[PDB]
Amino acid sequence: KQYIISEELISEGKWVKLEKTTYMDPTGKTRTWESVKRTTRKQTADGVAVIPVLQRTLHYECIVLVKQFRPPMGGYCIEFPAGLIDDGETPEAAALRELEEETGYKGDIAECSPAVCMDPGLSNCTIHIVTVTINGDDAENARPKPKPGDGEFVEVISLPKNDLLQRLDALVAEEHLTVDARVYSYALALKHAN
Amino acid sequence: KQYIISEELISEGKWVKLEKTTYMDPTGKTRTWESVKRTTRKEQTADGVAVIPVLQRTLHYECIVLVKQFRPPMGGYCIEFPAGLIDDGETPEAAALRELEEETGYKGDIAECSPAVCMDPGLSNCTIHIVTVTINGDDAENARPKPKPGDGEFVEVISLPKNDLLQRLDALVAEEHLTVDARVYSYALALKHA
Ligand SMILES: CCn1cc(CNC(=O)c2cccnc2)cn1
Ligand SMILES: [Cl-]
Ligand SMILES: [Mg+2]
Ligand SMILES: [Mg+2]
Ligand SMILES: [Mg+2]
Numbered sequence: 001k002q003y004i005i006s007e008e009l010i011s012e013g014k015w016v017k018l019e020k021t022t023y024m025d026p027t028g029k030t031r032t033w034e035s036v037k038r039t040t041r042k043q044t045a046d047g048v049a050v051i052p053v054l055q056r057t058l059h060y061e062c063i064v065l066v067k068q069f070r071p072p073m074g075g076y077c078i079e080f081p082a083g084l085i086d087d088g089e090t091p092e093a094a095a096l097r098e099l100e101e102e103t104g105y106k107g108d109i110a111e112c113s114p115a116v117c118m119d120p121g122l123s124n125c126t127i128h129i130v131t132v133t134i135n136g137d138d139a140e141n142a143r144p145k146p147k148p149g150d151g152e153f154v155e156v157i158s159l160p161k162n163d164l165l166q167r168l169d170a171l172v173a174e175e176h177l178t179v180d181a182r183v184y185s186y187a188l189a190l191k192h193a194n
Numbered sequence: 195k196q197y198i199i200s201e202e203l204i205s206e207g208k209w210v211k212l213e214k215t216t217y218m219d220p221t222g223k224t225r226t227w228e229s230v231k232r233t234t235r236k237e238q239t240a241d242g243v244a245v246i247p248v249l250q251r252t253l254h255y256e257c258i259v260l261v262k263q264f265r266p267p268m269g270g271y272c273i274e275f276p277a278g279l280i281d282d283g284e285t286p287e288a289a290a291l292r293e294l295e296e297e298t299g300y301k302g303d304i305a306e307c308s309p310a311v312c313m314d315p316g317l318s319n320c321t322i323h324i325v326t327v328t329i330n331g332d333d334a335e336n337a338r339p340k341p342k343p344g345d346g347e348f349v350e351v352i353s354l355p356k357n358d359l360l361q362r363l364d365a366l367v368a369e370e371h372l373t374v375d376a377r378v379y380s381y382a383l384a385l386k387h388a
């Protein structure tokens with residue numbers, strides 16, 4: 001019933017563009033929206049985010065997160081490891097690679113979402129969420145080696161899965177960090193389950 | 195270590211702008227980023243709210259109330275938590291309960307309110323509060339609830355059982371062209387993972 005009629009470029013940077021989208025509303029009235037897109041998409045999605053479940057015997061299961069300065073936020077954020085998918089790369093492969101580069105952990109794929117939207121009122125940006133388990137007792141994950149790309153500066157923060165939401169709240173309260181909405185949503189549901 | 199040095203307007207719409215962000219990297223070197231912001235944020239502690247609405251009714255399994263809308267940036271239909279921008283002077287809780295009623299017809303009760311969390315921090319400064327609200331589906335107010343959508347706003351309500359959320363989302367994605375939001379999918383995943 002609703003659909004895109006046209007898109008007008010407003011401004012294109014190296015990484016991001018802003019468009020004016022014209023669309024037909026379900027009454028048959030014509031309407032405009034300001035839309036953001038990445039200039040990098042080729043892929044099933046722009047990016048992957050990895051939910052990394054660190055499993056060590058005789059320990060709580062942990063969710064492995066990352067902390068990094070985010071220029072658009074003007075501050076540090078706590079997030080799932082994540083990055084853009086390389087042209088020709090599979091989401092699964094992008095997940096294991098990003099996870100290794102950002103955390104040093106080598107992990108196994110458990111499940112992979114369809115493409116899901118990041119902020120559909122604002123952008124067309126999509127990701128695959130990839131659940132990965134990490135056998136923390138294997139020698140390759142003993143002293144995990146983070147291999148950052150150029151200009152990446154990532155701190156790793158592992159938090160117990162069964163207390164994730166209280167732990168994140170603590171970090172916000174004391175460290176003045178910004179938690180990612182997908183992280184926070186996952187944490188909420190761990191508490192809301194049953 | 196890292197901080198913003200300057201922010202230069204590249205293009206400003208009515209709703210969104212694009213900025214050339216200059217910052218200090220942790221090595222002491224100056225770098226740039228392209229940043230999206232909204233033009234609408236004033237003194238709100240966040241741009242918007244998303245509501246996690248837990249519909250509770252005697253002798254029913256709890257349902258998560260979700261909305262389906264056409265999203266011009268995406269060029270299609272998306273399934274999301276009920277959400278909107280926080281009006282100037284409005285509390286996040288008030289905005290959550292107001293958007294929930296407008297989008298779904300339901301009158302909720304506040305359960306909890308997150309701190310400001312980031313929507314896509316590699317791209318934008320956009321933030322929300324994620325507000326958990328219970329809905330007393332036994333109350334006569336919530337019996338046959340009518341959305342009160344604004345001018346040009348057209349929302350469908352989809353209530354799904356919490357205890358099977360991920361499979362039910364997967365089944366809807368299998369039947370039609372539509373994208374699930376990343377926060378909704380994250381929440382459904384953690385419910386499975388718990
Ligand atoms: C469908 C009816 N309607 C019109 C508006 C006004 N436009 C915007 O809020 C907006 C925000 C971000 C980018 N572009 C446009 C809100 N609902
Ligand atoms: Cl798991
Ligand atoms: Mg990354
Ligand atoms: Mg990376
Ligand atoms: Mg809305």
Ligand SMILES: [Mg+2]
Nearest residue numbers: 277278293296
């Ligand atoms: Mg609304």
